Amino acid sequence: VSRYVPDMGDLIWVDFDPTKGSEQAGHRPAVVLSPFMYNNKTGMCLCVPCTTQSKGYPFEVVLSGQERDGVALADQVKSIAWRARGATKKGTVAPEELQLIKAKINVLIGH
Amino acid sequence: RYVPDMGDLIWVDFDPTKGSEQAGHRPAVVLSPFMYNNKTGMCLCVPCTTQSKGYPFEVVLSGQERDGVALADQVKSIAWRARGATKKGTVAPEELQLIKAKINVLIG
């Protein structure tokens, strides 16, 4: 394994399989929401899966400064065990984009 | 055909699940609206549990058949239609509200 731990606003490579359906699946990038201490202690995390297919859905947020231009899904929120699923740091995301994700999550469940 | 609405408590099979993530059949709280759930066939729910460890993010659910606790730390976007999520009841407004609060504190 490794000593790596996910932090808020990070970008990780994780496998979301198995999946029932219409739940972003397979290996892919995910933006980490939950803070470093929750991630560390609980060994779990909150994250939004990323995709290279932009269909123009409302909760889609565009991520720049990456290896392949794509979108993160803000309404797709995922609770996972990262230490168990072997999350790996893929990089970082700009504060504004993380902010738009978080902003959309309170819009989805704020109602 | 039934669709999950905000505040609804539903019965759903979370399997398969890996790690410390909640698995098996159990209730859950829909934090997503009716229209979204109806469109995407998806939804955001917090899985409940009968075992309260006194964890910081535990929100006590009162008034159900069993006395459990909903976990706000785990917010899962699942396909309720695909898993055949069934309505078990409703959570009191203040419960859904406390849940929203805790979740949004873990985020925001």
State the Cα–Cα distance between residues A76 and A90, nearest whole angstrom: 19
| Alpha carbon A39 to its chain's center | 13
Q: Which residues contact A73 (CB under 8 A, 6 or more apart)?
A: A24, A48, A49, A50, A51, A57, A59, A60, A61
Give the start-to-end residue ranges of the domains of chain B: 1-108
Q: B48-57 burial by CB neighbour count: b if 16+ within 10 A, else e?
A: bbeeeeeeeb
Q: Which two tokens stand for residue A101?
A: 């994700």
Residue B34, classified by CB atoms within 10 Å of its CB into exposed (0-12), middle (13-18) or buried (19+), is: middle
d(CA A91, CA B12): 34
- Verify cis geometry, omega within 30 degrees of 0, for the bond prior to A35: no
Contact present, A20 and B78 (Cβ < 8 Å): yes
The DSSP call for residue B85 is -
Total Cβ atoms within 10 A of residue A58: 11
Contact A20 B108 (CB under 8 A): no
Q: How far is A90 from chain B (nearest CA, A)?
A: 21
User: Comparing C-alpha atoms, which of B66, B68, B76, B65 is closest to residue B95?
Assistant: B68
Quick one: closest CA in B to A45, which residue? B74
Contact between B32 and A79 using a beta-carbon 8 Å cutoff: no
Resolution (A): 2.9
The 8-class DSSP code of residue A86 comes to: T
B71: left (phi over 0), alpha (psi -120 to 50) or beta: beta
Answer whether CATH 3.40.1000.10 is correct for domain B1-108.
no
- Any residues with CB less than 8 A from the CB of A83 and at least 6 apart, and which? A43, B19
The CATH fold assigned to A1-111 is SH3 type barrels. (2.30.30)
What's the alpha-carbon Rg for chain B, to the nearest Å? 13
Of B40, B73, B107, the CB nearest to A105: B107
Q: Provide the terminal-to-terminal Cα distance of chain B, rounded to the nearest Å.
A: 35
Reading phi first (left if > 0) and then psi (alpha if -120 to 50, else beta), residue B41 is in left
